[PDB]
């Protein structure tokens, strides 16, 4: 159940292997921009909600190609990918939300980000719940969690089990009745032959344990701090700047990240 | 803070190093037995309570030295010791309790074992809260293992679990939780401070009970850790077994050992 030997694959990397962003940057050309804008326009003219639609309903012959490349890079490649030239210039926030929804349909299934069920949100090392997190600039650091696992295997293997146990995170009030405020979420998991990671926002961890009325064990804080320290080493993360129209995508299974923008949460079903 | 090299010392052993019980067994002779009986008689005659007394008040000129070797064996040696010939023959349960109290005064301070504050109790691998657990047979298999050796074995076979033990698990309060707190409290299984590794492996049923009360499901890796601990302890080469005869008082040091089963039980802090 616990991986005792180094993880391998395209998602295991340091900064040197991904510094050349051309390996994972995907640029929308004028045709693709036009197709996406046209799709959003037709969704708006028919009074549809892009979140209720699927990809068959909004085909993108040429752009769907590129977004599919992105998905490939995210789920089977480095884990991160940038889609440039998202046609947001001159659009209102809501219109941009629709255009991002259009692109999102070709990423996977958009999921709720809060209690209000929002599928776009206007805006410490972490990786959120869904498979893919997307961030579009209207007007950023990434590291490999797999490499972090290998580094822990080298430097502090006695801590590995802790990550598999995970820590308590605040429910924020959405717990089903008759269960505690904070749920236990594993940081590392090994199932089916694959290692995956989630490193939720720590403070909600603190919030959650507080709500449970417990102090964090020191060894747990050591584990967390060690994780974040490994991610914070200059050789372990890549950094970038988004310009308007840039949509940065990270795969939360294998990476962790840190920072007007809009955010989308996507599960790959 | 986490020990990454094998523990060394007397308290590190397998069954082979402790199989010969003559290395840890201490025998009370007639003089010592008479001494203990006389102290008990005096305590009962004078209507005193042995649990409120102290080691000076009940001196044992010959027996105290032997009991002192028992203590040294427990805290600095193997971590187990048998005291034989405790004079319980022909005594009532209460009288036997007083005699045990007399011996206990030279072990350390007896502590409460339940909510009523009983300091003698009539009768999974575990080690109880106090420094020393004592078990005297009145009428008539006890197994002991080294927690230090178990730690070394974990270092070899499953070091990736070590941190979990340092985090410890939740154990049911049993209801004595200060009204403010959650029914269950977190207890570390291994600790390393001041150059010394120590262990407590509280009753597992209370771990499950305790997490249950909290409305949580034990993580699989946690049950793996617990099961691994106990499996290592349960290996034939890793534990020693004995049978108590009347007058035999087995003492285990809960800092460095774990153990498994009319007897009376005493809890002692040093
Ligand atoms: Mg984020
Ligand atoms: Mg016991």
CA-nearest of B200, B171, B202 to B184 is B171
Strand boundaries in A9-64, DSSP class E:
25-27
Three-state SS for A133-150 is EEEEECCCEEEEHHHHHH
Of B168, B216, B225, the CB nearest to A161: B225
How many helices, marked H, and strands, marked E, lie in chain A?
8, 14
Q: Which experimental approach was used here?
A: X-ray
Q: How far is A219 from chain B (nearest CA, A)?
A: 6
Backbone angles phi, psi at A59, to 5 degrees: -70, 145
Asked whether A159 and A230 are in contact (CB, 8 A), the reply is no
CA distance A122 to A102: 17
Ligand 1 centroid, distance to A201 Cα (angstroms): 9
Q: Which of B224, B154, B166, B189 is nearest to A190 (CA)?
A: B224
How far apart are the C-alpha atoms of B111 and B117, rounded to whole Å?
A: 8
Per-residue buried b or exposed e for B87-124, using 16+ beta carbons within 10 Å of the residue's own CB = bbeeeeeeebbbbbbbbbbbbbbbeebeeeeebbeeeb
- Least Cα distance to B77 among B135, B144, B28 occurs for B144
Which conformational region is residue A90 in: left (phi greater than 0), alpha (psi within -120 to 50 degrees), or beta? left
DSSP-derived 3-state class of residue B192: strand
Give the DSSP letter string of A80-138.
EEEEE--S-TT--HHHHHHHHHHHHHTT-EE---STT--SSEE---B--SSSEEEEEE-
Q: How far apart are CA B214 and CA A183, in angstroms?
A: 11
Residue B182 to residue A210: CA distance in whole angstroms: 12
Q: What residue numbers of A does the annotated binding site cover?
A: 126, 128, 257
| B200 token code pair | 């407590």
Contact indicator for B263, B122 with CB cutoff of 8 Å: yes
C-alpha angle A166-A171-A174 in degrees, rounded to nearest 5 = 145
Positions of chain breaks in chain A, given as the residue before each break (C to N > 2.5 Å): 123, 139, 259
Contact between chains at A161 and B1 (C-beta distance less than 8 A) = no
What is the least distance, in Å, from the CA of A205 to any CA of chain B?
A: 16
Contact by Cβ (8 Å): A71, A107: yes
Q: Measure B167 CA to nearest chain A CA, in Å.
A: 6
Q: Does the annotation place B259 within a ligand binding site?
A: yes
Q: How many CA atoms lie within 13 A of B189 on its CB side?
A: 30
Contacts B188 to A, Cβ<8 Å:
217
Q: Which ligand is nearest to the CA of B125?
A: 2
Provide the sign of the torsion angle of the four alpha carbons B205, B207, B208, B213, taken in this order.
positive
Q: Which residue of A has its CA nearest to B217?
A: A184
Residues paired with B122 in a beta bridge? B264
Of B127, B173, B158, B172, whose CA–CA distance to B221 is shortest? Answer: B158
**Structure-derived torsion over alpha carbons of residues A190, A192, A195, A196, reported in degrees to the nearest 10:** -90
Please enumerate, by residue number, every residue of A annotated as part of a binding site for Fe(2+): 126, 128, 257
Find the B90 Cα to ligand 1 centroid distance in Å: 76
Q: Which two tokens stand for residue B227?
A: 């099961």
Measured at the alpha carbon of residue A174, what is the angle toward residues A171 and A175, in degrees to the nearest 5? 70
Residues of A in contact with B163 (CB under 8 A): 158-162, 219, 223
CB contact under 8 A, A157 and B161: no
From chain B, the residues in CB contact with A222 under 8 A are: 1
Out of B162, B182, B221, closest to residue A158 by CB: B162
CB spacing of B4 vs A218 below 8 angstroms: no
B211 alpha carbon – ligand 2 mean position (Å):
21
Residues 6+ apart with CB under 8 A from A67: A26, A60, A83, A103, A106, A107
Q: For residue B164, list chain A residues with Cβ-Cβ distance below 8 A.
A: 161-162, 165
CA atoms within 13 A of residue A241's CA, in its CB half-sphere: 2
Domain boundaries, chain A: 1-269
- The shortest C-alpha distance from A62 to chain B (Å) reads 47
B159 closest CB neighbour out of A158, A162, A178: A158
Bridge partner list, B27: B84
Cβ(B22)–Cβ(A239) below 8 Å: no
Cβ atoms of residues A195 and A3 within 8 Å:
yes
B2: chain A residues, CB-CB within 8 Å: 158, 219
Neighbours of A118 (CB within 10 A): 15
* Placement of tokens 């977190």 in the chain: B186
Cβ contact (<8 Å) for B2 and A219? yes
Report whether A214 contacts B182 (CB < 8 A).
yes
Of the CA atoms within 13 Å of residue A48, those in its CB half-sphere come to 18
CB < 8 Å to B216, chain A: 180, 184
- Cβ atoms of A83 and A244 within 8 Å: the answer is no
Q: Do B221 and A4 touch (CB under 8 A)?
A: no
Contact call for residues B263 and B149 (beta carbons, < 8 A): no
């Amino acid at each position: 159940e616990i991986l005792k030997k180094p993880v391998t694959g395209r998602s295991v990397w340091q900064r040197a292997q991904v510094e050349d962003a051309s390996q994972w940057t995907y640029v929308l050309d004028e045709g693709m921009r036009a197709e996406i804008l046209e799709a959003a326009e037709r969704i708006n003219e028919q009074g549809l909600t892009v979140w209720d639609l699927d990809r068959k309903a909004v085909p993108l012959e040429r752009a769907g190609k590129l977004v599919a490349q992105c998905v490939e890079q995210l789920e089977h490649g480095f884990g991160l990918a940038m889609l440039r030239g998202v046609p947001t210039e001159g659009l209102t926030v809501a219109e941009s939300q629709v255009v991002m929804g259009v692109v999102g349909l070709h990423l996977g299934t958009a999921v709720a980000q809060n209690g209000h069920g929002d599928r776009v949100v206007s805006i410490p090392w972490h990786s959120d719940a869904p498979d893919i997190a997307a961030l579009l600039c209207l007007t950023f650091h990434v590291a490999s969690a797999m490499h972090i696992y290998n580094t822990l295997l080298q430097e502090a293997p006695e801590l590995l089990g802790l990550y598999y146990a995970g820590v308590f995170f605040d429910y924020r009030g959405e717990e089903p009745p008759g269960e505690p405020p904070a749920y236990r979420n594993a940081i590392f998991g090994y199932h089916n032959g694959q290692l995956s990671c989630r490193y939720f926002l720590r403070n909600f961890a603190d919030s959650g344990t507080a709500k449970l009325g417990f102090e964090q064990p020191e060894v747990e804080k050591l584990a967390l701090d060690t994780f974040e320290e490994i991610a914070s080493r200059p050789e372990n993360h890549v950094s970038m700047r988004l310009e308007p129209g840039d949509m940065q995508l990270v795969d939360d299974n294998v990476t962790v990240h840190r920072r007007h923008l809009l955010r989308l949460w996507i599960n790959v079903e």
